[PDB]
């Protein structure tokens, strides 16, 4: 039917900063649990709450605090922010204490030293080599999302509108091309004949994860908040 | 308690169409076991839950893993043909029977590589204070970095007079990738400018790399990336 949620889903803060994490536990569910997990790293457990009382604490940092409400849903309250809390923060709900837990899909915080560092990608779309073509009769479009910092990007291909998977090929990890700018590339593969029907529509469509309405930013450039990049083609006859 | 589940093994690097086994040992007593997949940066994937070895539950569980509970509870993830979208953090979980509370596992990092010949471990760098900063600050901070490594198996940690230390260190949360085969990591350890002035105070950057298996196969030419224990250390000093 539906699972626990939770907002935001990607947050970016300056050292120093605070925020607020947020968790809707299924509905029917009185037991609300908080992780905090390093990237790549095991599970951490934080805290359990259940029936708005405290049940359980693990290693939850003095600067946290959390507290669940009337209708079950808990809060992080997370302050005076460091580089080292930068993690996935998941919380999961059971219908009681000592019961089966279901997960939130987590929260991605990163905390940066200078928000100025802050800069969408721009990406660009590489139509097929003409020597890729008469060689092999595949065709294939590179993808480059670059000048990013920092790296929360979602990359996505669309062909005549819809997403498509098959022939895709993504960098698994982006990587710094300088101390603030990310790069990732990806190629879509295609049949020679697909790629050269003129009608065809290609879009490599990006998501960047930035700053939100709610972070100053200073007068000068635009704002660096969440938003999407993309570059298309068409497909070309011989 | 008295312990929690355990998992094997801890890490471990893989060639594209290859298969491996992940397994888990639940808590004394446990007898229901589920396993979930984690990219990394994302979300637990639930894949299957066996009950007094009873398949249950099953959620998108590729065709390629097959999954058993055996007669001690304990379970073994059997992989094949692995992908490289394959990589990522296995964990297992245990509750006494289905519905209850589950504990986790350590988890298993399992990475899968087109080519074993990329691996490498890192090189470790220990850099003394800057005699601006001891003589401005009255802090001594010794920086680590370890790099050149691939993949992202690495883990630092900071002795003092033999003993690990927790206070005054700073470690970079996550390593970043420099290029498509080699990642970055850098610690601090700061501590007072008189504790640094001692030349019998031993300070050592301690970084564990874990690679290649005794038993996979290398090429003849330079040393195989297995894993293995590399620091770098300095002792305090004297007025300069």
């Known amino acids: 039917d539906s699972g626990v949620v939770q907002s935001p889903r990607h947050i970016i803060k300056e050292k120093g900063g605070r925020s607020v994490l947020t968790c809707i536990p299924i509905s029917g569910h009185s037991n609300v649990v908080w992780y905090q997990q390093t990237l790549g790293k095991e599970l951490k457990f934080?805290?359990?709450?259940?029936?708005?009382?405290?049940?359980?604490?693990?290693f939850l940092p003095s600067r946290f605090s959390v507290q669940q409400f009337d209708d079950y849903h808990s809060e992080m309250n997370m302050s005076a922010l460091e580089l080292e809390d930068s993690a996935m923060?998941?919380?999961?709900?059971?219908?009681?204490?000592?019961?089966?837990?279901?997960?939130?899909?987590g929260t991605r915080l990163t905390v940066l030293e200078d928000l100025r560092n802050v800069t969408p990608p721009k990406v660009s779309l590489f139509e097929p080599s003409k020597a890729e073509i008469a060689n092999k009769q595949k065709a294939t479009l590179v993808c480059l999302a670059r000048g990013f910092f920092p790296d929360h990007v979602e990359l996505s291909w669309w062909v005549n509108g819809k997403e498509v998977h098959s022939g895709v090929s993504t960098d698994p990890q982006a990587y710094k091309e300088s101390n603030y700018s990310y790069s990732l590339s990806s190629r879509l593969r295609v049949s020679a004949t697909f790629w050269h029907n003129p009608r065809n529509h290609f879009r490599c469509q990006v998501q960047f994860h930035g700053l939100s309405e709610e972070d100053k930013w200073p007068e000068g450039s635009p704002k660096p908040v969440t938003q999407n990049i993309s570059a298309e083609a068409w497909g070309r006859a011989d | 308690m008295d312990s929690g589940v355990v998992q094997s093994p801890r890490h471990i690097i893989k060639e594209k169409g290859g298969r491996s086994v992940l397994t888990c040992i639940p808590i004394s007593g446990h007898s229901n076991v589920v396993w979930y997949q984690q990219t990394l940066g994302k979300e637990l994937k639930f894949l299957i839950q066996?009950?007094?070895?009873?398949?249950?539950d099953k959620g998108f569980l590729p065709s390629r893993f097959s999954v058993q509970q055996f007669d001690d509870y304990h379970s073994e993830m059997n992989m094949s043909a692995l992908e490289l979208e394959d990589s990522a953090m296995?964990?297992?979980?245990?509750?006494?029977?289905?519905?209850?509370?589950?504990?986790?596992?350590?988890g298993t990092r399992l990475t899968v590589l087109e080519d074993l010949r990329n691996v490498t471990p890192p090189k470790v760098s220990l850099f003394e204070p800057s005699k601006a900063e001891i003589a401005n600050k009255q802090k001594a901070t010794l920086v680590c970095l370890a790099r050149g490594f691939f993949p992202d198996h690495v883990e630092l940690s900071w002795w003092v007079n033999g003993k690990e230390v927790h206070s005054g260190v700073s470690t970079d949360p996550q390593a970043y990738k420099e290029s498509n085969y080699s990642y970055s990591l850098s610690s601090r350890l700061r501590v007072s400018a008189t504790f640094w002035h001692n030349p019998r105070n031993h300070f050592r950057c301690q970084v564990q790399f874990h690679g290649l298996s005794e038993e996979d196969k290398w090429p003849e030419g330079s040393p195989k990336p297995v894993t293995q224990n590399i620091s770098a250390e300095a002792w305090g000093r004297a007025d300069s």
């Open positions: 999961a709900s059971s219908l009681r204490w000592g019961d089966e837990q279901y």
């Open positions: 066996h009950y007094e070895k009873v398949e249950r």
């Open positions: 979980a245990s509750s006494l029977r289905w519905g209850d509370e589950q504990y």
